[PDB]
Write a protein that binds this ligand. Structure first.
Ligand SMILES: Nc1ncnc2c1ncn2[C@@H]1O[C@H](COP(=O)(O)OP(=O)(O)O)[C@@H](O)[C@H]1O
Length: 258
DNA sequence: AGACGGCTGGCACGACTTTTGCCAGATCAGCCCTGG
């Protein structure tokens, strides 16, 4: 509900439309898909969805679907009421349940193994997750929001990703425009990144931007995303020096031998 | 008198019991120090 303090810096007149779209999704409990490319700041949008929802007071755990162990999947997702030691007074909590009352964020959906895919598909459709041991089903209420950069229709075509959980979890998608599509906010991000760098390196003052530098970073196909642009500025501002002259040289990729 | 049947015990082979040998840590509550 309360707008958390985050950097979205939106002026592209397309990012504003995406922001309105996600704001419309803020109250609803329906599953949400975030579609983007490398970088693109999808995590900020996901945090925006969770943190402007009715259940925002709830927790906001975010699991890395690539990071879950294969064998330990069941206990990791559910937990075991039995303690680690004899006569234990408590148990470890699984990924699920630890999310109840709030949203669960999923990332790298495409690279999730088939074991994760099939185990996660069963739990969402019905809930009633049961920890290993005992016969007591616990009912859960968790919002799911996920972000990915690969092409899950192609993943379905190859069959390396099950289409059923996709269909269940594809109520609505939000499209994120690439930085090259935005092509208007580059000045403001460049400047904000440079100002942050000024304090990080403890440089005294920002020198300024030359027209040649503006032309070169503007006239770029930008396969890299906002973070690639961020790193670019980071490299050039440091290589420039102590701001006695305006910033003049931009190195697009630090790989050319020279 | 010799062979046949019978009785008993040692040894062996699964199947199941029972005997010992493991060696802390995290977590919570009250008191003391310190900031408002
Ligand atoms: N609007 C924005 N404001 C501030 N930073 C941004 C914005 N968009 C992108 N970024 C930067 O780009 C990065 C994208 O990270 P992330 O969303 O994790 O990429 P991916 O979704 O591919 O994993 C973030 O670390 C963030 O610092």
């Amino acid at each position: 509900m309360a707008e958390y303090k985050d950097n979205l810096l939106g002026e592209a007149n397309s990012f504003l439309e995406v922001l309105e779209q996600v704001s419309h999704l803020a109250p609803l409990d329906k599953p949400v898909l975030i579609i983007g490319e490398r970088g693109t700041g999808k995590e900020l949008i996901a945090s925006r969805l969770h943190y402007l929802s009715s259940r925002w007071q709830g927790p906001f755990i975010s699991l890395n679907c690539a990071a879950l162990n294969e064998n330990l999947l069941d206990s990791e997702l559910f937990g075991h009421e039995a303690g680690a030691f004899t006569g234990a007074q408590k148990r470890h909590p699984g990924r699920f349940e630890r999310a109840d009352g709030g949203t669960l964020f999923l990332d790298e959906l495409a690279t999730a193994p088939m074991m994760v895919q099939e185990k996660l598909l069963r739990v969402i459709e019905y809930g009633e997750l049961e920890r290993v041991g005992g016969s007591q089903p616990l009912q859960v209420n968790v919002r799911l929001v996920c972000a990915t950069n690969a092409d899950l229709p192609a993943m379905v075509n190859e069959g390396t990703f099950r289409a059923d959980l996709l269909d269940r979890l594809a109520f609505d998608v939000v499209q994120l425009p690439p930085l090259r599509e935005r092509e208007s906010d580059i000045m403001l991000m460049a400047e904000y990144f440079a100002i942050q760098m000024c304090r990080e390196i403890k440089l005294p003052l920002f020198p300024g931007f030359t027209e040649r530098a503006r032309e070169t970073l503007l006239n770029y196909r930008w396969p890299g995303n906002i973070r690639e642009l961020k790193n670019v500025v980071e490299r050039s501002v440091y290589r420039h020096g102590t701001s006695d002259y305006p910033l003049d040289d931009i190195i697009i990729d630090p790989f050319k031998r020279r």
